[PDB]
Structure 1
Amino acid sequence: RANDAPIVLLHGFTGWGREEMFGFKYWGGVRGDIEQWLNDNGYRTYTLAVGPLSSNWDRACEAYAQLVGGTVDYGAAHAAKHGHARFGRTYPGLLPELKRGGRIHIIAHSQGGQTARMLVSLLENGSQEEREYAKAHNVSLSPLFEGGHHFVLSVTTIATPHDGTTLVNMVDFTDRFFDLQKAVLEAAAVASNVPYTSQVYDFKLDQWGLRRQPGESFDHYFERLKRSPVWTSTDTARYDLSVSGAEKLNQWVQASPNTYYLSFSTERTYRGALTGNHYPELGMNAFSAVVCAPFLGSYRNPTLGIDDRWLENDGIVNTVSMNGPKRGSSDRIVPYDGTLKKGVWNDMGTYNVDHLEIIGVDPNPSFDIRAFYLRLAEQLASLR
């Protein structure tokens, strides 16, 4: 121990706030509540809750405002390009002292990892698209695009598609993605064919002008979300989750030399005897084992360099993708030797735990979830 910085949890393409999903936690699922375990052991922990289906850009902006307070500013240039509100919601700020000079650790799961890397990237460097635009059109700029804000001491990514996931290429992907979404609903005891009055699981699509209406089931809403810009356009989680889009992301989102990056990879498959294809183990969450993993560990594509190294998977994301960014990237990934190195991806290795088990959404009695996150917190509680 000798940094005191809070931990900040960050979900992926599925995820909600503490008040949401009737208290059923993204971080902990059926195992309990990970934020609470940490706080009770004296690691101060806060939870971010951004647009699950939105782009990493949108989510970083949302994430910044949630962190220091204010209205979400997606950028005038960006807003004009993609045709959506410049301005979002207002947040009181979890840590407004961070302007004056605190520090955070981000712990991020799934696509959260991409959004954490880009939050840090934008914090340090800004965007010269938004800078040039603002002076061109004589409007204001969110401090997020100025640069010189260095306040993230660590990004820890867990089961993140740094190079993408190959699931995106699946033939029925659009439909099966929203079935994943409905599965995670069921996991939380929430049904998709009933008009919940309460918002329950808010997708936070204020920018796009999309909300679930009174008397609208999730099935219906998702059926509308499929035909919408949040599934259709460039500016989406779907896009940044494909192998090509992660590629574009990687090309501009580099590791801050002032941040400690950590990666945890996941696996819940075994190699074939005569092939190299991967197959889901007994105990992989039902939805992934049936719908997703067969494709994930058989899909080969010589054009995109998708060979045997991509087949091992955690039921959702190709395991090789979680090391750190590689495709389109300059960053350096090193195996964990004992001392966590700065400005580089410290590969903490691979765990026999599926995309939903590591967060607790699917059970795994063999995997001690509490010990994994408490072990992590203490690694993070060592310093610069």
Structure 2
Amino acid sequence: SRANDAPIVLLHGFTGWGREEMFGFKYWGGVRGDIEQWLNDNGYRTYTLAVGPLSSNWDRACEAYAQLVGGTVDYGAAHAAKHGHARFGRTYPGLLPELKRGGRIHIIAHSQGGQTARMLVSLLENGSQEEREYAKAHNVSLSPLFEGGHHFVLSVTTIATPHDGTTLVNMVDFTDRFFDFQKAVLKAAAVASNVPYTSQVYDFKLDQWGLRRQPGESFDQYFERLKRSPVWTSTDTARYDLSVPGAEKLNQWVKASPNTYYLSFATERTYRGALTGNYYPELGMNAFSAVVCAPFLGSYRNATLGIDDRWLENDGIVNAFSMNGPKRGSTDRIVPYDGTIKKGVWNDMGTYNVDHLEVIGVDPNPLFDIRAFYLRLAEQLASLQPHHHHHH
């Protein structure tokens, strides 16, 4: 039964856009419909965040914070100095002023959004020692995001999240492939990548880096310009955080909070070949992944990096082994779901037979009851007890 009234906030991965972008084709729902609307219609108050798809998780967390409570994004003076981008970014009105008033939220996150969600919780609770020390030593102001002490997040749910990275980043032509993925997602929205649309269509929100699509420029052209830009070549990027070493580095500091419930869902869309031990894409997997990414993910081994046979099963973009929670470089505890959702640990909800884009409706799958999936999840989050209790 309903034990809390916290609203749900949806958070995308290294692809994703606001509700008004992409001509109204939703990242959360895609060709299937509008997940936020379904949840709202069913009595579960739900909102959606839109942050930089290619930006580092740090940048995304700072963007998510401002978007939630309102104000100007503040990446931190120490962080900005370190990486060479603007300290202040876009200004937001704030989706949920209730937060500065003792309210809490449930975050449902897909792909890299699960890293961002985890990071946000960490900053909200503990702040950043490094930013605190820099502000004192340099006499600069400090965002509350870096002071700690907030209590805004009741739970975090991740879907198809590369908690331990994805080996997709290891492809020799990953740079070109990754942008082709962006192009494949545009195509699912019926948007061409060789047309210089005058409307925005898809904002990568690279305000901090000073990058934006220019007049007369197609997405193909823009992407060629981003591949050579700091959001692709620096360590302050989605690209780095998505890698196995980058994810490991993130796990070293982004820990599960004992005040928050964590739920993890894995996805897989492959079969094992009996002769090679490799994994192959199943019928129905999105075409781009089936041809360009799945074959690699299902066969790439690297002993020195610690990529073994456990990593071969995949959803076409992320290795399933990486999804149940952070493990590499992490102290977090992961427990298989046994009927009780516990606070401060990863509740492994299992593996679902869907692909990376099917789980959010971007790619069709008439056998996947997506409406039921999200409604069941919503009822579960609504049933979570704030401060529960011990018994026989």
Aligned length: 384
Cα shift readout 1:132-169 (whole Å, capped 9, x = no counterpart): 00001111100000000021000000000000000000
Distance in 1 between residues matched to 2:276 and 2:309, nearest whole Å: 9
Distance in 2 between residues matched to 1:206 and 1:275, nearest whole Å: 46
TM-score normalised according to structure 2 size: 0.98
Secondary structure of the 1:46 match is strand
Secondary structure of the 1:365 match is coil
Cα shift readout 1:73-104 (whole Å, capped 9, x = no counterpart): 00000000000000001100000120121000
TM-score normalised according to structure 1 size: 1.00
**What's the RMSD between the two structures over aligned residues?**
0.5
Give the CA deviation at 1:311.
0.1
Give the CA deviation at 1:275.
2.6
Give the CA deviation at 1:382.
1.0
Give the CA deviation at 1:67.
0.3
Distance in 2 between residues matched to 1:115 and 1:276, nearest whole Å: 33
Cα shift readout 1:13-72 (whole Å, capped 9, x = no counterpart): 000000100000000000000000000000000000000000000000000000000000
Cα shift readout 1:278-298 (whole Å, capped 9, x = no counterpart): 000010000000000000000
Distance in 2 between residues matched to 1:339 and 1:247, nearest whole Å: 28
Cα shift readout 1:336-362 (whole Å, capped 9, x = no counterpart): 100101100000000000000000000
Secondary structure of the 2:51 match is coil
Question: Structure 2 matches for 1:268-307, cutoff 5 A?
Answer: 268-307=269-308
Q: Which residue of 2 aligns with 1:18?
A: 19
Cα shift readout 1:198-220 (whole Å, capped 9, x = no counterpart): 11100000000000011110000
Say if 2:266 and 2:324, in contact at 8 Å, map to a contact too: yes
Give the CA deviation at 1:383.
2.3
Cα shift readout 1:312-332 (whole Å, capped 9, x = no counterpart): 000000000001000000000
Question: Structure 2 matches for 1:344-355, cutoff 5 A?
Answer: 344-355=345-356
Distance in 2 between residues matched to 1:92 and 1:3, nearest whole Å: 26
Distance in 2 between residues matched to 1:211 and 1:319, nearest whole Å: 34
Give yes or no for the alignment of 1:141 onto 2:137. Answer: no
Distance in 2 between residues matched to 1:60 and 1:108, nearest whole Å: 13
Say if 2:40 and 2:46, in contact at 8 Å, map to a contact too: yes
Give the CA deviation at 1:113.
0.1
Say if 2:154 and 2:260, in contact at 8 Å, map to a contact too: yes
Give the CA deviation at 1:304.
1.2
Secondary structure of the 1:291 match is helix
Distance in 1 between residues matched to 2:308 and 2:384, nearest whole Å: 39
Say if 2:102 and 2:151, in contact at 8 Å, map to a contact too: no
Cα shift readout 1:249-284 (whole Å, capped 9, x = no counterpart): 000000000000000000000111123210000100
Say if 2:155 and 2:262, in contact at 8 Å, map to a contact too: yes
Q: What runs of 5+ residues in structure 2 fail to find an aligned partner? A: 386-392
Distance in 2 between residues matched to 1:97 and 1:365, nearest whole Å: 38
Distance in 1 between residues matched to 2:98 and 2:360, nearest whole Å: 29
Say if 2:256 and 2:345, in contact at 8 Å, map to a contact too: yes
Distance in 1 between residues matched to 2:98 and 2:50, nearest whole Å: 20
Distance in 1 between residues matched to 2:322 and 2:270, nearest whole Å: 15
Distance in 1 between residues matched to 2:295 and 2:353, nearest whole Å: 17
Greater mean alpha carbon deviation, residues 273-282 or residues 363-372? 273-282
Say if 2:76 and 2:142, in contact at 8 Å, map to a contact too: yes
Displaced runs of 4+ in structure 1, greater than 4 A?
Answer: none
Secondary structure of the 1:14 match is coil
Distance in 1 between residues matched to 2:40 and 2:254, nearest whole Å: 31
Distance in 1 between residues matched to 2:359 and 2:189, nearest whole Å: 16
Distance in 2 between residues matched to 1:142 and 1:123, nearest whole Å: 11
Secondary structure of the 1:197 match is coil
Secondary structure of the 1:133 match is helix
Secondary structure of the 1:129 match is helix
Secondary structure of the 1:303 match is coil
Distance in 2 between residues matched to 1:105 and 1:276, nearest whole Å: 39
Say if 2:57 and 2:119, in contact at 8 Å, map to a contact too: yes
Cα shift readout 1:174-226 (whole Å, capped 9, x = no counterpart): 00000000000000011001111111100000000000011110000000000
Distance in 2 between residues matched to 1:201 and 1:325, nearest whole Å: 30
